[PDB]
Amino acid sequence: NVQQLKKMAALKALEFVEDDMRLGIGSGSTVNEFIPLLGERVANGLRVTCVATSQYSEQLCHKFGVPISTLEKIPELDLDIDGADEIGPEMTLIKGGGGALLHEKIVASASRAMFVIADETKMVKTLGAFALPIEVNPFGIHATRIAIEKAADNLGLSGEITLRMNGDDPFKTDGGHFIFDAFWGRILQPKLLSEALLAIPGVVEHGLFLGLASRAIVAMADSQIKVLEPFDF
Amino acid sequence: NVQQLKKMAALKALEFVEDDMRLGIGSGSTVNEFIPLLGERVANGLRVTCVATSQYSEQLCHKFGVPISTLEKIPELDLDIDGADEIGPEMTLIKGGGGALLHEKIVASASRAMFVIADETKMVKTLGAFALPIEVNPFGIHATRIAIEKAADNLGLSGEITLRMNGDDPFKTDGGHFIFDAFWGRILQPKLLSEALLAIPGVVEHGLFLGLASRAIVAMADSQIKVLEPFDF
Ligand SMILES: O=C(CO)C(O)[C@H](O)COP(=O)(O)O
Ligand SMILES: O=C(CO)C(O)[C@H](O)COP(=O)(O)O
Ligand SMILES: [Cl-]
Numbered sequence: 007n008v009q010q011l012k013k014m015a016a017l018k019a020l021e022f023v024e025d026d027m028r029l030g031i032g033s034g035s036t037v038n039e040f041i042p043l044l045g046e047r048v049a050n051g052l053r054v055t056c057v058a059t060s061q062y063s064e065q066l067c068h069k070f071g072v073p074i075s076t077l078e079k080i081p082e083l084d085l086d087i088d089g090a091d092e093i094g095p096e097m098t099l100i101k102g103g104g105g106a107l108l109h110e111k112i113v114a115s116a117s118r119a120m121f122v123i124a125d126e127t128k129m130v131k132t133l134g135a136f137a138l139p140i141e142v143n144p145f146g147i148h149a150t151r152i153a154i155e156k157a158a159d160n161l162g163l164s165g166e167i168t169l170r171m172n173g174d175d176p177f178k179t180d181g182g183h184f185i186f187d188a189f190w191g192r193i194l195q196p197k198l199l200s201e202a203l204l205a206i207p208g209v210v211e212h213g214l215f216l217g218l219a220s221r222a223i224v225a226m227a228d229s230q231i232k233v234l235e236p237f238d239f
Numbered sequence: 240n241v242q243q244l245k246k247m248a249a250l251k252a253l254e255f256v257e258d259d260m261r262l263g264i265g266s267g268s269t270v271n272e273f274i275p276l277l278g279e280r281v282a283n284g285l286r287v288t289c290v291a292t293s294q295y296s297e298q299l300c301h302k303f304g305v306p307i308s309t310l311e312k313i314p315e316l317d318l319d320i321d322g323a324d325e326i327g328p329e330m331t332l333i334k335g336g337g338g339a340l341l342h343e344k345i346v347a348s349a350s351r352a353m354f355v356i357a358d359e360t361k362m363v364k365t366l367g368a369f370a371l372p373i374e375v376n377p378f379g380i381h382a383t384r385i386a387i388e389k390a391a392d393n394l395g396l397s398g399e400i401t402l403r404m405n406g407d408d409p410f411k412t413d414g415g416h417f418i419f420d421a422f423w424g425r426i427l428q429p430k431l432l433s434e435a436l437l438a439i440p441g442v443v444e445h446g447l448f449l450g451l452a453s454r455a456i457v458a459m460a461d462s463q464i465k466v467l468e469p470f471d472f
């Protein structure tokens with residue numbers, strides 16, 4: 007069902023991939039359907055060099071013969087292909103549910119275009135039902151927590167703020183950080199929330215991608231695969 | 240002679256330290272004059288608990304019997320005592336010459352008041368002669384260098400952006416990050432530049448402390464010690 011929708015979305019996004027392209031490769035279950043398809047194309051002659059955004063995306067790339075490089079070697083990419091936890095107005099996204107948002111966000115900024123692949127449930131009228139992830143420094147995290155609570159209060163946001171755990175330890179990102187998930191339910195002013203969060207010293211990054219996504223490739227329940235632009239949101 | 244001025248600033252700031260305060264302890268050569276003095280007061284029965292902002296400041300704290308705790312234990316501090324590479328209009332700071340900007344800014348943020356201690360030379364009419372430090376993520380650092388170069392162009396800034404070295408190994412901060420020093424020479428729009436840099440995914444933080452300092456204690460070559468407020472800048 008959704009796995010079907012994800013694969014459909016992935017197949018269609020794959021049509022925009024051309025020879026000698028440098029690609030950003032995102033993370034999550036939808037991108038995991040895209041990587042092997044890409045590898046099948048590479049085994050049939052397609053030339054690409056990819057930058058992965060997580061260890062599991064990188065693993066899959068190696069496994070399926072997708073050539074892998076780094077942003078040190080290729081600082082500017084042609085196209086980024088990634089998923090999203092949510093796609094809202096102007097194709098603002100929430101990402102980071104799998105914990106890879108930092109590398110994902112850096113890779114998206116380094117790309118001439120970012121295409122989002124998704125099944126229709128990711129499309130929302132308003133952002134926020136999916137808890138916003140917020141990458142934070144371990145040092146002074148308690149004070150960073152208080153600062154995010156107070157910023158939430160000022161902006162009229164309500165909901166638990168939870169430290170993401172891996173069993174008994176905090177979950178630690180690739181960049182060596184921790185993550186807070188903020189269950190704010192509705193984010194009406196994402197540009198203001200993003201500015202307020204980034205200004206907090208202990209906040210490394212957050213999962214609101216604003217004006218980064220250029221196309222959303224969304225597979226619908228009725229089998230339509232729509233190629234959408236930010237004006238469609 | 241400037242060492243004298245540093246001590247004079249430190250002695251004066253020490254007078255605002257009262258029994259049972261929770262103190263932030265900054266870093267730098269000026270703060271290195273303050274810690275032993277504080278230690279000498281502790282020997283005499285003054286009671287304080289300090290959060291240090293660098294390894295060297297913590298080392299000096301232990302060496303002089305200044306008690307040490309964490310933001311985890313004490314999330315909100317009464318008073319932060321720190322130096323500054325520059326003190327400009329509205330008491331905006333540039334900090335991070337010694338490499339400790341992130342922990343310094345988290346601590347500053349977590350305090351009720353922040354006191355800057357400085358010799359006369361740090362007061363500037365316009366910020367920017369001192370290279371602005373920018374803490375960045377190692378992942379995608381090349382891409383981040385480019386995005387900073389682009390943000391600079393948009394704000395009309397020019398100059399070399401060099402990576403902080405410690406040997407022929409990039410200097411790694413306590414947060415596990417690298418630092419770019421931006422030799423822009425002049426920064427007339429510090430708030431816009433702050434907003435811009437923080438929006439760049441790989442930028443963890445930077446050395447512009449805006450509306451964080453509440454008093455500057457500045458020792459002048461004529462022996463005056465001025466206790467100054469942001470209204471005085
Ligand atoms: O990288 C991600 C999280 O770090 C995502 O792409 C996001 O979580 C969406 O994943 P999915 O494709 O499983 O919906
Ligand atoms: O921690 C600092 C740099 O990280 C500072 O306090 C700033 O660099 C001022 O240094 P100094 O007092 O040595 O002139
Ligand atoms: Cl092909």
Ligand SMILES: [K+]
Binds near residue numbers: 206208444
């Ligand atoms: K920040």
Ligand SMILES: [K+]
Binds near residue numbers: 211436441442443
């Ligand atoms: K950032």
